[PDB]
Design a protein around this nucleic acid. Structure first.
Ligand SMILES: [Mg+2]
Ligand SMILES: [Mg+2]
Ligand SMILES: [Mg+2]
Ligand SMILES: [Mg+2]
Ligand SMILES: [Mg+2]
Ligand SMILES: [Mg+2]
Ligand SMILES: [Mg+2]
Ligand SMILES: [Mg+2]
Lengths: 136, 61, 213, 98
RNA sequence: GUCUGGCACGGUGAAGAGACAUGUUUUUUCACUGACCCGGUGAGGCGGGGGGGCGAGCCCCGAGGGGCUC
RNA sequence: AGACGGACCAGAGCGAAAGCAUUUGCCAAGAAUGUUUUCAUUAAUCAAGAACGAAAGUCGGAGGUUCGAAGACGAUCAGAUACCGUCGUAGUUCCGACCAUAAACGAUGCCGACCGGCGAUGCGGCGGCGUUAUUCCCAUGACCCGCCGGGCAGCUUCCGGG
């Protein structure tokens, strides 16, 4: 009896918590509180090599797996919360965010309230690299 | 999840040598839904494809 | 191996009576095994949720926090914990070739609730204006910060948190701060941002229920 | 040979200025050099828009944007093909394009 | 000499879980004090209570009372 | 727990220069403007001499998140005791004394006069139609339109030079 409030229209909310960046991509479904977790998934658990972890393909596969494990419990709707590395890094999303999100919708998960969440430090510590940066 | 699609218009060549080409397509089962894809070989407006990865949403190469 | 979810229980969360829609989404807890009781491990979660979905006649760019405090019969009755604004809006307001003003304060309401308030305002461009800039001088700004702190203290040292939230929802604090300062500079855009709650008294159950009844 | 009159940096009457750090390069440059740029992009990028708005829960859901300030080096910029070199007389235009 | 396990000095109560086999003791945790130990003092005003009242704020309130916090 | 003070931040302001950015309070200085106040040539530039002087660095205490010369490893390479990645000492932080250098650049000594225009910006003073202001009409900015001073800069030219 997983959410036994049976009305066939009482949508059950969760949140997704996408953390996208370079070299990785995470999809971490939780409840309204973020304290209880449901099938955290990545991009590295699907592909073989290490230089194709952060591809939209591995992102798409992850959401399809998550959506499967999520519809097996009565969770129907979601709220989306997006994140970049932040701190003193790029603080722009990576190339796995677009692909993952779209694959949830077209799989069917009745989403609302997509928003961003990212640190944005006011004037925090000194960044790595050393005054001339990486001189490739 | 094998699919079909007809072609609407050709955009431009691409690739390191001008062998692939950009196109726009509708899926022959719903008319509103649409994507753009890379193909190889002589392709004209008025054609039909056998798509396997139903969604890629490719860009400039 | 056994799936670790079969031994769990879906409960419900419940909001106070100041809000029209009192019924929100659900949560889940684990059952009771010796120590580590459900209600104890359930006490203290914080359900960030918007304000449109509580009222459906109100703005969307606000958030309330709504900690839980007590439980009775698979329904978690909450209390106020905090307020917060939304970032898309905040970054939208911050524009260029104008001036930004900020202020804050600490005050203790009638009860023992101590809380720290924050405010913000932006200067305006008159509709016939050409000079592109619309900056201010430092002096008259000091007046405005001073004027903010007066208004908040006046409003908050009089009431205990049922009145105060009913001001916050249609934020009249800032609509009045707008009205005051328009004889110095206009300040078209004004808000109360953040209402973190620094200290709280003990748990008086009778107070909670009659608020939540 | 002064290639420029500004000397490349809009100081004109200070003495000293604070630095910043390139968002890619990671190097330490002043705030009057160090090309600026401002992003007001959406989040879904013109492709999945129809899919979301049909699979929503709300009614048409205005769908927020994303805001960023960007700093670039001079070196990292030209390699990114933001700006380009110019000829002698056209260096003296302080206008951006449409 | 020193580390460590066990029996005795070793008492009161409450929760959780066991091996046998269909209760036994066991145990981990919380609390108590009366054995035991420690410090201070010329063993000098401890706890409840209302005879307290100089006052305050919370209730009923004959505005005069007593109830609560001090 | 210790550092840092984002976006607002501008060919905008201040300071002898080095250099200066969260709130508030205190302490003592200063430019410009305004002036039918005052003293009456008291001044400009300056060998010797004297104050201040980024970063690194040295000395004695307190502290030690982040970054990271040295230093050790893993890769690329014909070789790399470098460019890359992971760790990581001195130092980076505050209090008190030393040193006195830089593309310390406007690569342009200070004082004073004269010599062409135009539209702006920042401070102060003088005025004028009008709009708002605020709470019933005034003195506050805000613009609207001009002027005057002394400032940071800018566009244009057969002034004239080179
Ligand atoms: Mg300098
Ligand atoms: Mg000399
Ligand atoms: Mg130094
Ligand atoms: Mg030093
Ligand atoms: Mg030392
Ligand atoms: Mg390191
Ligand atoms: Mg020298
Ligand atoms: Mg020189």
């Amino acid at each position: 009896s997983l959410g036994p409030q049976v009305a066939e229209g009482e949508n059950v909310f969760g949140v997704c918590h996408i953390f996208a960046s370079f070299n990785d991509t995470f999809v971490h479904v939780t409840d309204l509180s973020g304290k209880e977790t449901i099938c955290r998934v990545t991009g590295g658990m699907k592909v073989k090599a290490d230089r194709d972890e952060s591809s939209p393909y591995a992102a798409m596969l992850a959401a399809q797996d998550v959506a499967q494990r999520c519809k097996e419990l009565g969770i129907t709707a979601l709220h989306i919360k997006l994140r970049a590395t932040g701190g003193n890094r790029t603080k722009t999303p990576g190339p796995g965010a677009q692909s993952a999100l779209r694959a949830l919708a077209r799989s069917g998960m009745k989403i609302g309230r997509i928003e961003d969440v990212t640190p944005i430090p006011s004037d925090s510590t000194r960044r790595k690299g050393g005054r001339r940066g990486r001189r490739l | 999840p094998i699919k079909l699609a007809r072609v609407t218009k050709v955009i431009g060549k691409t690739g390191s040598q001008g062998q692939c080409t950009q196109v726009r397509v509708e899926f022959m089962d719903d008319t509103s839904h649409s994507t753009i894809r890379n193909v190889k070989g002589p392709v004209r407006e008025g054609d039909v494809l056998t798509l396997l990865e139903s969604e890629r949403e490719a860009r400039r190469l | 191996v056994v799936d670790p979810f079969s031994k769990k229980d879906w409960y419900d969360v419940k909001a106070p009576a100041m809000f029209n829609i009192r019924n929100i989404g659900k949560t889940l807890v684990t059952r009771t095994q010796g120590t580590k009781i459900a209600s104890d491990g359930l006490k203290g979660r914080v359900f960030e949720v918007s304000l449109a979905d509580l009222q459906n006649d109100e703005v969307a760019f606000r958030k309330f926090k709504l900690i839980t405090e007590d439980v009775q019969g698979k329904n978690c009755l909450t209390n106020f914990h905090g307020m917060d604004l939304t970032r898309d809006k905040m970054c939208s307001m911050v524009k260029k070739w104008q001036t930004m003003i900020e202020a804050h304060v600490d005050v203790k309401t009638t009860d023992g609730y101590l809380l720290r308030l924050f405010c913000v305002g932006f200067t305006k461009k008159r509709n016939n204006q050409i000079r592109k800039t619309s900056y201010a001088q430092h002096q008259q700004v000091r007046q405005i910060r001073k004027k903010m702190m007066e208004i908040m203290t006046r409003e908050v040292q009089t009431n205990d948190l049922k009145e105060v939230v009913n001001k916050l929802i249609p934020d009249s604090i800032g609509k009045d701060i707008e009205k005051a300062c328009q004889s110095i500079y206009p300040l078209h855009d004004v808000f109360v941002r953040k209402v973190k709650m620094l200290k709280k008294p003990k748990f008086e159950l009778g107070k909670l229920m009659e608020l939540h009844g | 040979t002064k290639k420029r009159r500004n000397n490349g940096r809009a100081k004109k009457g200070r003495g000293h200025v604070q630095p910043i750090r390139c968002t890619n390069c990671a190097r330490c440059v002043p705030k009057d050099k160090a090309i600026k740029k401002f992003v007001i992009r959406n989040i879904v990028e013109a492709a999945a828009v129809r899919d979301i708005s049909e699979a929503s829960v709300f009614d048409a859901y205005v769908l927020p944007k994303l805001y960023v300030k960007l700093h670039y080096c001079v070196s990292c910029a030209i390699h990114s093909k933001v700006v380009r070199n110019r000829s002698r007389e056209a260096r003296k235009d302080r206008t951006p394009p449409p």
